[PDB]
């Protein structure tokens, strides 16, 4: 890999510079290089990895949705030729490439070395997230992609329920995203709503144990659960 000759610490330093410069493709390449050094990632480093790829794939998904909408309108309309489908396919292929890259880093070998709840649940949530992004564009093995997302989320949920308090931000964010999975991907809006509500209510009852700073961290994600519940009910 092109980052093989750079020091692990330099890659992390440059990932942080890239974030400040809003250069998320560079940020992701730097964190990919750091992961490929083979050592486990710290809490901060896991966050950098997540931020980098979330921003990269977020641009691709937003573009894919614009192009998919144009394509759908085209099939409602003058024939414009193959260009809309071609260009949607180009963006889709690049998006799938990024998801495959992230899933490859998780499989080789982040997840198998992650033993603490905070690292293991984080990586399994990420695995669910990137299979979910694959599911968003899947039209053919679509069922297997969906089940791969579900299975990763479910393993993360099981660990988070046993090893983490209900206010833990990773547990909360996992539940938020698995709820979106149920709503958007699995055609299970009732499961989505039940999960978001139970997650919110159990976190509410645990806030009294927290410091002011942890309270702020947890209530921020609880607000996202409430936002989705408001949208869906």
């Amino acid at each position: 890999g092109a980052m093989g000759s750079m020091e692990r610490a330099s890659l992390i330093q440059k990932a942080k510079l890239a974030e400040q410069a809003e250069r998320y493709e560079d940020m992701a390449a730097f964190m990919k290089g750091a992961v490929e050094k083979g050592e486990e990632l710290s809490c901060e480093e896991r966050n950098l990895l997540s931020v980098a790829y979330k921003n990269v794939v977020g641009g691709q998904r937003a573009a894919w949705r614009v192009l998919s909408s144009i394509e759908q309108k085209s099939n409602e309309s003058e024939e414009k030729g193959p260009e809309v489908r071609e260009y949607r396919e180009k963006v889709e292929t690049e998006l799938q490439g990024v998801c495959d890259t992230v899933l490859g880093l998780l499989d080789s070998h982040l997840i198998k070395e992650a033993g603490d709840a905070e690292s293991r649940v984080f990586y399994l949530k990420m695995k669910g997230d990137y299979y979910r992004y694959l599911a968003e564009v899947a039209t053919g093995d679509k069922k297997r992609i969906i089940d791969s997302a579900r299975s990763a989320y479910q393993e993360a949920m099981d660990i988070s329920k046993k090893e983490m308090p209900p206010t833990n931000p990773i547990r909360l964010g996992l539940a938020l995203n698995f709820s979106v999975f149920h709503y958007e991907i699995a055609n299970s809006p009732e499961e989505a709503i039940s999960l978001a509500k139970t997650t919110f209510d159990e976190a509410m009852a645990d806030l009294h144990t927290l410091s002011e700073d942890s309270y702020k961290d947890s209530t921020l994600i609880m607000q996202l659960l409430r936002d989705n519940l408001t949208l869906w009910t």
């Binding site: 997230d129 938020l176 979106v180 709503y183 994600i221 996202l224 936002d227 989705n228 869906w232």
Partner: peptide
């Protein structure tokens, strides 16, 4: 748009 993390 619905929220994810």
């Amino acid at each position: 748009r619905r929220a994810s993390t």
